């Protein structure tokens, strides 16, 4: 061999054999000499790092600890869906959802299934981020997490289809709660407000850290325990995918936050201003759900867990 890797990889890592992740993920994007300004943006170029107020000398400081290029992502997901699909077939063949009481089924349609709308919101926000971030290391983590949100939304929808014998009536019932029930309106308002945020790192902070960082613990940990007291323990086998996904998501989201916050005090002051604005809204969005189920204590526990996580970045919340 005349050389061991591509020139752009050798500049970063040395002329030595490189990993599949390295060759897939660094310096592949177009960086300069764009021919035309966007017809849809007056302030920024194509591929413009200034789409966020966050500043980085090298956005490739954000690397994925999971080392997910496409092949490793789908490989990992295919393994996880094999178990989820089997649990769905098992519950469906033994009538584990349809044999629950009518009150229990209504609790699931009202408190769990409308989270598929929140997942849709997260899918859209992450698609936005993937189209707006410059570095391939950052943009691919956002499309993978985006498609994951769609898939989680689809598993939630299937819980309702299982309850209704595959007619759609339960999904209709559950959408009416999302649209018209007072308990969901703070969350619906919050999700719609995120859809209008311009700065992509503000958006990733709010969606992938603040909302998910409290919501996932609240729902798939705290309400999960509560559902067992309500006779719905068997739903836990259908929501195991969400717990495993979330534990995995901590790895890249914490890695990204450490790199950005550790870059500069000016970055930290920006992130804190955004935490101070948005973190209380995430708490207020979740409060009616928590008080309709596990209780407010379960939400304060989730809020304190996020506060402790934010200390890893030298940031804080209440």
């Amino acid at each position: 061999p005349i050389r061991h890797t591509y020139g752009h990889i050798a500049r970063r890592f040395g002329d030595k054999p490189a990993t599949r992740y390295q060759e897939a993920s660094y310096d592949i994007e177009a960086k300069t000499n764009f021919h035309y300004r966007p017809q849809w943006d007056s302030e920024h170029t194509l591929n413009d790092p200034t789409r966020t107020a966050i500043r980085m000398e090298d956005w490739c400081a954000v690397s994925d600890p999971r080392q997910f290029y496409y092949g490793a992502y789908v490989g990992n997901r295919a393994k996880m869906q094999e178990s989820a699909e089997t649990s769905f077939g098992f519950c469906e063949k033994r009538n584990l959802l349809t044999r629950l009481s009518e009150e229990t089924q209504k609790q699931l349609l009202r408190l769990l299934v409308p989270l598929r709308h929140v997942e849709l919101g997260a899918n859209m926000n992450n698609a936005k981020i993937a189209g707006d971030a410059t570095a391939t290391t950052v943009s691919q983590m956002h499309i993978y997490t985006g498609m994951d949100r769609l898939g989680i939304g689809q598993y939630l929808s299937r819980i309702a289809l299982m309850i209704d014998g595959s007619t759609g009536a339960a999904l209709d019932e559950s959408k009416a709660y999302w649209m018209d029930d007072e308990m969901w309106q703070p969350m619906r308002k919050l999700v719609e407000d995120t859809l209008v945020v311009d700065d992509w790192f503000e958006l990733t902070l709010v969606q992938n850290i603040l909302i998910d960082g409290m919501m996932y613990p609240l729902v798939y940990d705290k309400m999960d325990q509560w559902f067992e007291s309500q006779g719905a323990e068997d739903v836990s086998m259908l929501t195991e995918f969400m717990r495993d996904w979330y534990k995995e998501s901590l790895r890249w989201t914490n890695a990204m936050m450490k790199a950005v916050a550790g870059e500069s005090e000016t970055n930290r002051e920006l992130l804190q201003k955004w935490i101070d604005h948005w973190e209380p809204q995430a708490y207020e969005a979740l409060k009616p759900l928590a008080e309709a189920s596990v209780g407010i204590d379960g939400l304060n526990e989730a809020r304190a867990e996020l506060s402790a996580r934010l200390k890893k970045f030298e940031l804080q919340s209440r």
Binding site: I2, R3, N33, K79, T136, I143, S157
Partner: protein, 494 residues
Amino acid sequence: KKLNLKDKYQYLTRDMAWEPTYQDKKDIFPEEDFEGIKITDWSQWEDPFRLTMDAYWKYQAEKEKKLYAIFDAFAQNNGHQNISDARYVNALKLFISGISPLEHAAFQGYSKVGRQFSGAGARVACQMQAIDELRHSQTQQHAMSHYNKHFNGLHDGPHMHDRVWYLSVPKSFFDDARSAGPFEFLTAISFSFEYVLTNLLFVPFMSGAAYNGDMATVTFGFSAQSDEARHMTLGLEVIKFILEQHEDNVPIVQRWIDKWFWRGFRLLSLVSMMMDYMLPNKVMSWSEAWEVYYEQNGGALFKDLERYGIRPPKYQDVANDAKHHLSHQLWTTFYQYCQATNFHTWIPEKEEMDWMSEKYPDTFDKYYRPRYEYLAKEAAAGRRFYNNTLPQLCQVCQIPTIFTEKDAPTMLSHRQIEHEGERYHFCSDGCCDIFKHEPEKYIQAWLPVHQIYQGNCEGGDLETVVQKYYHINIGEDNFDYVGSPDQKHWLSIK
């Protein structure tokens, strides 16, 4: 009653969306009005494929595990030694620096457009296309990896794509689409590129691989087939959906078809040269590929679109006629300028030339064979021709102005205009008409020749531009194939 498969899939995708109460729909989806396209009813969107995420992951993981097993076996067994001839690797230098970066651009462009549409159904199709293009981008980097260890010119693809003169052709094609609004982006890329012109890009590269012993590339091509089936169906859904939504959409779409037909045709001129000249074992000629994939298949598609009031693209006759000339004009251009490219060129063997006479009975012996006769006599005399003067580039497609009039193959089809006190030049009427409709856009072009003369290419003399700006290693990546390090390494491999 129990849902059928189409209504079930809708419940698992579009039903998750809702009408906003707390934010204006026009603030959440601000980009879908400014192009003039009117959407009457998003629910009339028909899903071009119905794949839930579980099934997507499962099937793609199966293809990937197989693809990577083959890639490792190729590398472990030095499969680069089994290609027909090292000349073939020049097709891959062109691919990694001019086509792979487009896959990656399509990933970002589709990600963004999978946020902009208010139809939940259209957003999911676009997002699945985005993550497929990411796949195509990364698996191509992995495919070419082993070639990069053994051959020159593959080492700085993305760096060269932003800078090198001839790579501004694919780059500005895709910059044009991504700077455009979302409907034009879809019309350009999903319908024109991925549906109409797709086979002209895919078939030559992938079947060239099959005829020339390149197991890595052909395996990548087999692997991408099921993906492209979805991408073609989205392209077909896109034009039908848009044309049916409002009669006012029809003339706007017509203009986009005329523009992107013509830009796509100019972009593909690079492939015509590859398949006729860069492949040691030939698949078919450019003229035969054009005739089957565009004249026959495209003719039937445009007959289908007549029911909407759509006519075939403007100047398609000029393109049908250029098929007899295109590959020969371009190879001769790259030959004289390859002191400044990251791939080699050479004079075709006498057997390739007799194949050319047969595939091009009305043009090759008259116009092109004598060029190779002269250039070979010159090379034999130690005067291998390189052209040391920079060329005029088209203001729109940015190819040097090397193309000839339909009626007169020896006369350049140059056009020029005055626009607000400045002069602009084009390779053809097709590019002229595109500029005239959107001058404010095309006057922004980063034309590499002009940029060198402005002093924006870190160099005034061309050796410094090539070595220091382009990162082309002079004497290694550029110049004639005969006497190159690739030829010497091949002859010693053999």
